[PDB]
Amino acid sequence: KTHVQLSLPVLQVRDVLVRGFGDSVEEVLSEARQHLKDGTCGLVEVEKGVLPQLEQPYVFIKRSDAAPHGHVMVELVAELEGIQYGRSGETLGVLVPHVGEIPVAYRKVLLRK
Ligand SMILES: CC(=O)Nc1cccc(NC(C)=O)n1
Known part of the structure; x- marks a missing residue:
């Protein structure tokens, strides 16, 4: 698909152990793609003070459409020293490895793979 x-x-x-x-x-x-496929990808919601606590290059999920079965359509955009690789909509958050951290919530997304 x-x-x-x-x-x-x-x-x-x-909480994030691998930043x-x-x-x-x-x-x-x-x-990011491999972890999304293997179900080992977490999402951190971007606010003031969040990104400087994570490791560059960053991978964002960004809204790609203006939501089948509740899943917001998103694509991946990477960032390194203020340059982005891809063009997309609003940031839903930054992706990180998930190694067993307890989540606060779940974000339903439909990923263009
Ligand atoms: C079934 C499934 O989760 N497939 C999936 C998910 C994320 C990424 C990919 N493959 C690529 C190439 O991004 N496949």
Whole structure:
């Protein structure tokens, strides 16, 4: 399928044990995709003070459409030193590895894969 229904665990930034996916734009987008497929991807909601606590490059999920079965359509956009790789809508949050942190909520998304 070109799109996949996912429920992402929403994590508090201070709980997150692995604060990014790797060391290059290409690696973080690769790792983010693999973790989304394997069900090992969490979401951190972006507010004042959140991003400086996480590791660059960042991977955002961004709203791609203005929501089948409650799942907001999103795509991946990476960021490194203020340059973004991709073009999309509003940030739903930043993706990180999920290694067993307890979530506060779930974000239903439909991912263009
Ligand atoms: C079934 C499933 O979850 N598939 C999935 C999810 C996220 C990513 C991908 N594959 C790619 C290439 O992004 N496949």
